[PDB]
Amino acid sequence: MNLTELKNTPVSELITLGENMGLENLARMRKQDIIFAILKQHAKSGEDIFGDGVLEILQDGFGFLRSADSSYLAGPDDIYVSPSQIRRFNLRTGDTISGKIRPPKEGERYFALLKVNEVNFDKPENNKILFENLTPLHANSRLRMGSTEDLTARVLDLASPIGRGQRGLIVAPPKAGKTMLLQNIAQSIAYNHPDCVLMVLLIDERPEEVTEMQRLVKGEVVASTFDEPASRHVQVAEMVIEKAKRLVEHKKDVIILLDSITRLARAYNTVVPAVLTGGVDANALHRPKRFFGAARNVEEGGSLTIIATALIDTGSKMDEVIYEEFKGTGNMELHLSRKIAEKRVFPAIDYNRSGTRKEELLTTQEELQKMWILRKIIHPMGEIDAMEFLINKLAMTKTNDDFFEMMK
Ligand SMILES: Nc1ncnc2c1ncn2[C@@H]1O[C@H](COP(=O)(O)OP(=O)(O)OP(O)(O)=S)[C@@H](O)[C@H]1O
Ligand SMILES: [Mg+2]
């Protein structure tokens, strides 16, 4: 009846509730392999099979529909779309095509697309692409974040005020709390602004840390693992950013929580050839600069906001040079010191140097004069002790009267 079901359903409910259709031996069949053998048996005799996925136009002329569940990996369970179907409808990589599918004829090998119900959560009626929309400022609306899973969200709203559509960069050494900071920020998105679309992207990630991430975040989670080829990392990032573009064309506010822009740039460097000072090829950091460069604040309606992690102190010469490039391109900085976290103080934020560009119109009027002086009294603090001056007064009330009573 549906494809959105079979791809996500338990892996063993296919040999229990699908084998009873009369199949030979599903001993060593991959997840997507069996789903193909079930659809190519359910549809053969009078049915109404639905189908959905995200479009990826290849190079020749056609483009398949890929599963967001499989991190956009390609298998037998992909819906084929004819070049002629990319003609009548103005199709661009990143479109969510939902419609009635059909079994292969004789030699097609890929389930083809027939009827097209909704193109990007809407009937085929087309508008203004991202490359045409004006880009005035990151600051229009703000996304603000005495419990426990709010104490790190508290210093986030004080150090680096996030905006509804903003280029964000988190600079953190390994083991400072970055892979756990994203699952902290993502939590406070569906707990404050559930209207926003959420996509978490993890490039060159650890397998067991992917599962922890997807079973904790309220939204879409796509990732690549450190065993997958350099070309694979490119695809997932090329799929997420192109899809998020299609939604922003539809006035929708999208947020991307990218992890490892360095490991993403390290991927592009490996694929894009052709002049390499510091390990990285000079004419290669163009592609990852474009990814991060898309995060804007559309005037015509919409919001693209990427907050990516720029890894430092990896030891590798390459990862060091990648940050040197992005240093100031983003208009939001959130540092994590590997000395505050060293002494088991884990909200390890270098508050002193974590400001945002043009934060004057990102907040309420009566908020700046206190925020600056609140830092002017934290300027001569330091490292470990600095995160003890703004954690004790923070442990009391919410955010407002945090510095009201105690001001001797
Ligand atoms: N918000 C937080 N609250 C409490 N503890 C935290 C927080 N963030 C990080 N930590 C602690 O700091 C450690 C950091 O581990 P992770 O959550 O994996 O972060 P990480 O810096 O990305 O680690 P790596 O470099 O990927 S192995 C964990 O053992 C946590 O106990
Ligand atoms: Mg990690």
Side-chain angles (χ1 to χ4, degrees), residues 1-46 48-408:
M1 199 72 75
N2 279 72
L3 180 55
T4 322
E5 291 171 8
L6 286 163
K7 295 188 286 183
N8 297 75
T9 41
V11 294
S12 299
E13 211 176 64
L14 279 69
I15 318 160
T16 309
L17 202 70
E19 185 217 296
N20 304 313
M21 295 200 82
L23 307 166
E24 286 87 6
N25 44 285
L26 322 164
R28 47 180 52 82
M29 289 256 286
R30 265 89 200 275
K31 204 191 294 183
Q32 307 96 67
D33 296 9
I34 322 159
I35 303 164
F36 181 72
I38 292 161
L39 285 176
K40 210 184 83 70
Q41 209 88 304
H42 180 78
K44 72 192 287 282
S45 197
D48 316 308
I49 43 158
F50 287 159
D52 81 308
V54 193
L55 182 76
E56 184 190 290
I57 311 164
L58 276 302
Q59 200 199 130
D60 292 68
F62 53 77
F64 291 99
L65 284 168
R66 337 235 81 162
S67 178
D69 162 68
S70 301
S71 281
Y72 304 109
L73 187 81
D77 69 319
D78 288 294
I79 307 155
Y80 184 91
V81 183
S82 182
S84 65
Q85 289 171 293
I86 303 169
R87 300 196 71 82
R88 190 168 74 180
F89 322 92
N90 297 308
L91 292 192
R92 285 153 66 90
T93 293
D95 286 322
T96 313
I97 308 299
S98 303
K100 299 178 196 176
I101 59 164
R102 66 164 188 92
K105 294 174 192 289
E106 213 146 66
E108 290 187 304
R109 297 174 183 184
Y110 296 96
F111 259 73
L113 187 84
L114 258 173
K115 286 147 181 67
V116 192
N117 182 222
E118 291 204 337
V119 182
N120 304 296
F121 306 99
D122 201 294
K123 279 157 278 294
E125 192 184 320
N126 294 290
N127 272 239
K128 42 181 83 175
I129 44 157
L130 201 274
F131 312 99
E132 314 314 309
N133 311 334
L134 282 314
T135 312
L137 295 169
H138 58 85
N140 273 65
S141 176
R142 180 179 169 175
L143 267 66
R144 199 183 270 94
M145 281 71 193
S147 60
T148 310
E149 312 287 74
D150 196 76
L151 201 64
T152 49
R154 214 160 294 171
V155 274
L156 199 82
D157 302 329
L158 291 159
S160 62
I162 320 288
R164 200 166 284 265
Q166 189 167 28
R167 273 176 281 267
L169 197 74
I170 291 170
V171 199
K175 292 142 194 176
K178 51 187 170 71
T179 324
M180 220 210 89
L181 185 60
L182 291 174
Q183 55 189 283
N184 185 283
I185 296 162
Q187 193 210 305
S188 192
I189 294 296
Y191 203 68
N192 275 291
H193 336 273
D195 65 298
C196 292
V197 198
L198 194 145
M199 276 186 276
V200 168
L201 186 56
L202 315 162
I203 306 296
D204 210 52
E205 181 69 284
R206 266 176 306 182
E208 94 280 33
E209 213 143 72
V210 180
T211 51
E212 184 84 68
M213 186 71 79
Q214 60 197 157
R215 208 201 104 273
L216 218 145
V217 164
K218 321 286 176 184
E220 212 170 76
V221 180
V222 277
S224 58
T225 46
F226 62 81
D227 55 282
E228 290 190 300
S231 60
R232 181 84 187 94
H233 306 284
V234 182
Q235 195 191 145
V236 202
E238 227 81 283
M239 280 302 294
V240 172
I241 231 300
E242 274 275 54
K243 185 208 166 184
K245 256 182 264 184
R246 301 293 93 90
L247 283 167
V248 166
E249 291 162 3
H250 276 47
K251 330 276 262 76
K252 261 276 181 180
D253 301 348
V254 192
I255 309 162
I256 308 160
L257 295 187
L258 174 59
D259 199 68
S260 309
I261 203 166
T262 56
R263 293 192 268 213
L264 176 58
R266 270 209 60 183
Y268 280 116
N269 186 204
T270 312
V271 196
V272 177
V275 280
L276 31 90
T277 300
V280 273
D281 190 283
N283 197 205
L285 293 161
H286 165 240
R287 287 183 165 273
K289 261 182 167 180
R290 193 206 276 183
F291 187 125
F292 191 81
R296 53 195 52 187
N297 200 317
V298 179
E299 190 187 37
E300 286 96 296
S303 151
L304 207 303
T305 149
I306 300 160
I307 304 157
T309 52
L311 315 183
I312 201 79
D313 304 305
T314 316
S316 59
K317 299 175 190 290
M318 222 201 286
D319 287 287
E320 262 188 55
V321 188
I322 300 161
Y323 173 57
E324 188 233 289
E325 310 282 77
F326 290 90
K327 205 268 166 185
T329 47
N331 57 318
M332 185 242 89
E333 289 182 76
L334 198 280
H335 289 77
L336 306 178
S337 287
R338 211 211 63 188
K339 51 202 81 69
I340 305 168
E342 168 212 352
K343 264 78 174 69
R344 279 150 205 200
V345 181
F346 296 119
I349 294 174
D350 210 299
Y351 182 93
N352 315 294
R353 34 89 66 87
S354 295
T356 50
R357 290 149 179 84
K358 341 278 176 175
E359 72 164 306
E360 295 95 293
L361 67 171
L362 200 267
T363 56
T364 315
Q365 199 287 313
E366 203 73 277
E367 208 181 327
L368 277 169
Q369 23 67 279
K370 61 170 280 179
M371 269 197 286
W372 191 286
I373 294 298
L374 207 140
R375 183 193 263 93
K376 207 169 178 178
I377 62 168
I378 300 302
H379 195 72
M381 249 73 265
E383 39 175 312
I384 171 173
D385 298 7
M387 263 308 302
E388 292 301 303
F389 207 104
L390 295 171
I391 215 271
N392 68 305
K393 306 278 194 290
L394 206 76
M396 266 68 261
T397 42
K398 303 94 191 70
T399 48
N400 193 285
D401 71 298
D402 200 279
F403 206 64
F404 234 140
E405 186 191 296
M406 300 163 84
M407 53 174 284
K408 278 174 75 188

